[PDB]
Amino acid sequence: GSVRIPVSCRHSGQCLRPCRDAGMRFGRCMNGRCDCTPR
């Protein structure tokens, strides 16, 4: 998604919890950082 959070990753699975804990959804890893979809 299009919110970029300052959390590092190499796989989208690693972004599931960071995005949830940020109040957002559908964590994905893009260019080694997590992206989230706003509620």
Given the rule CB under 5 A, which residues bind Cl ion? 25
Beta carbon nearer to Cl ion, 8 or 17: 17
Minimum CB separation of residue 26 from Cl ion in Å reads 5
Minimum CB separation of residue 21 from Cl ion in Å reads 11
Closest-approach residue to Cl ion (CB): 25
Contact in structure between 22 and 5 (CB atoms under 8 Å): yes
Minimum CB separation of residue 31 from Cl ion in Å reads 20
The three state secondary structure string of the chain is CCEEEEEECCCHHHHHHHHHHCCCEEEEEECCEEEEECC
